[PDB]
Symmetry: D2
Subunit: 134 residues, 4 copies
Amino acid sequence: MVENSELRKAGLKVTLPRVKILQMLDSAEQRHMSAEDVYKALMEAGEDVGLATVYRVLTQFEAAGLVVRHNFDGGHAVFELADSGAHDHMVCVDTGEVIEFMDAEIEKRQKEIVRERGFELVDANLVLYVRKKK
Amino acid sequence: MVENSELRKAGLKVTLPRVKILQMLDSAEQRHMSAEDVYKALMEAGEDVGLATVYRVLTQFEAAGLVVRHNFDGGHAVFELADSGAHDHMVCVDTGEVIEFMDAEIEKRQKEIVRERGFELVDANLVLYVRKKK
Amino acid sequence: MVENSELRKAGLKVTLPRVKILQMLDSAEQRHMSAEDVYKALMEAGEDVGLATVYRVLTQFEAAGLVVRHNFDGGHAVFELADSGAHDHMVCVDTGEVIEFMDAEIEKRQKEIVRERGFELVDANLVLYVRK
Amino acid sequence: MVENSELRKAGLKVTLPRVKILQMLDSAEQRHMSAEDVYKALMEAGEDVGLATVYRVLTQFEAAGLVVRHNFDGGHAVFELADSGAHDHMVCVDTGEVIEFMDAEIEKRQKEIVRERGFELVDANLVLYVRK
Ligand SMILES: [Mn+2]
Ligand SMILES: [Mn+2]
Ligand SMILES: [Mn+2]
Ligand SMILES: [Mn+2]
Ligand SMILES: [Mn+2]
Ligand SMILES: [Mn+2]
Ligand SMILES: [Mn+2]
Ligand SMILES: [Mn+2]
Ligand SMILES: [Mn+2]
Ligand SMILES: [Mn+2]
Ligand SMILES: [Mn+2]
Ligand SMILES: [Mn+2]
Ligand SMILES: [Mn+2]
Ligand SMILES: [Zn+2]
Ligand SMILES: [Zn+2]
Ligand SMILES: [Zn+2]
Ligand SMILES: [Zn+2]
Ligand SMILES: [Zn+2]
Ligand SMILES: [Zn+2]
Ligand SMILES: [Zn+2]
Ligand SMILES: [Zn+2]
Ligand SMILES: [Zn+2]
Ligand SMILES: [Zn+2]
Ligand SMILES: [Zn+2]
Ligand SMILES: [Zn+2]
Ligand SMILES: [Zn+2]
Ligand SMILES: [Zn+2]
Ligand SMILES: [Zn+2]
Ligand SMILES: [Zn+2]
Ligand SMILES: [Zn+2]
Ligand SMILES: [Zn+2]
Ligand SMILES: [Zn+2]
Ligand SMILES: [Zn+2]
Ligand SMILES: [Zn+2]
Ligand SMILES: [Zn+2]
């Protein structure tokens, strides 16, 4: 996507680090990245952005809604482009593996539960902690 | 419930502060309490437990599974006795009001989504952020 | 008492809530406010900002460097303007009373420690948990 | 190298994972490990502890006072044995390099500040963010 239109969308001055990090997420191979993952990846692509900046920019992106922040294993923060796959996850509680899913039935029931009570749905989070039965 | 059987359940030496705080939760009027709420309430009932202890004991309880920890408004931690109502919440994103719900349809679909993929369900969290439409 | 100029240096478009929250933090300059505390105060003043809007603006400000975020008692987040005094606190473990202090000897020793190591000092944080 | 006696003082029943994780933290005493780092090491050693079990044990230890929890780079939690040295760190903002230091002048001034105020000192934390 057009990073510069997005940064204007979110009320954020277009600056070099903001554009480099957003390009990294857009083009990232792995969908769930730690702040350290983004910093390692920028080094790889030969971009000079310190870990402190990387985390601050991810925090602005989250607050602006560009990115969703999770804590699946409890011990480190995951950032994820804020698209519609970002809200439905199964977590293997023994390995830390994260698996996205989408079930139209559950998406529809969620809107029902909330309208029947006089509300509109702003946002849903569903996390399914799972174990491989055998 | 019998606090002392619970503390043994969870691998926790029975001590005065652990039993006072657990009695407070069991008998609390409000279901979602900050650490500050529990400390204020203990003062009220005329029990001498410092804020630092209160938070540490809640942290042990969470880790032992006796209590569930949420962050609904992003700005403060909520502790909640770990019963079956502790995993399904709507949050009014303008007021911070939290409302528990239970929908048997959604509970059943969640088990389906996970067995059809070779897993057993250890735990589910569902948070519905809502706005009062009018 | 409000500033769009503070927001610009931060690289942040000027908006109703950013301005209202920012001058709220300024016209209440030593309180150590939670997100809820800010939300309550705006309601008094008669603003209309949702609670989630408050917390997202305060997080934007933290990232931008306009505000410092602490968690003193473990339970709730404190948002403080990034002034001199915002990095040195004593904290009463039993009550959660928070108290800013500033000690020039301490602040001098910090810079010497760092200089004697070939580093420059970007920021320091000191928290003293105390009782009695 | 493992201790059920450490666990007892903490008020914690002695269990397989608590013991295995505890001696893992001891036989790797200056690493500043994440929950994942601990989980990986146990797998090497050939233990069988789930990742979520690791993190819950480390949280129990933090609450019990056996371990100190830091978040140095903002992104992941660090779990450190609560020894001397576990509360004073420099931190390279650009790389996340972490370095323990201890300075007796600083440690002396801290106790004077607190004493001159009628307080006793329960715990202090110093973090110096540095570059170059
Ligand atoms: Mn981790
Ligand atoms: Mn709050
Ligand atoms: Mn359904
Ligand atoms: Mn702080
Ligand atoms: Mn609190
Ligand atoms: Mn509090
Ligand atoms: Mn200072
Ligand atoms: Mn000195
Ligand atoms: Mn720390
Ligand atoms: Mn990280
Ligand atoms: Mn990290
Ligand atoms: Mn020290
Ligand atoms: Mn001195
Ligand atoms: Zn792009
Ligand atoms: Zn999450
Ligand atoms: Zn999440
Ligand atoms: Zn979501
Ligand atoms: Zn969804
Ligand atoms: Zn259905
Ligand atoms: Zn979202
Ligand atoms: Zn009871
Ligand atoms: Zn939650
Ligand atoms: Zn929750
Ligand atoms: Zn749950
Ligand atoms: Zn449920
Ligand atoms: Zn269904
Ligand atoms: Zn649970
Ligand atoms: Zn102005
Ligand atoms: Zn101040
Ligand atoms: Zn600071
Ligand atoms: Zn700072
Ligand atoms: Zn032993
Ligand atoms: Zn150490
Ligand atoms: Zn410490
Ligand atoms: Zn400590």
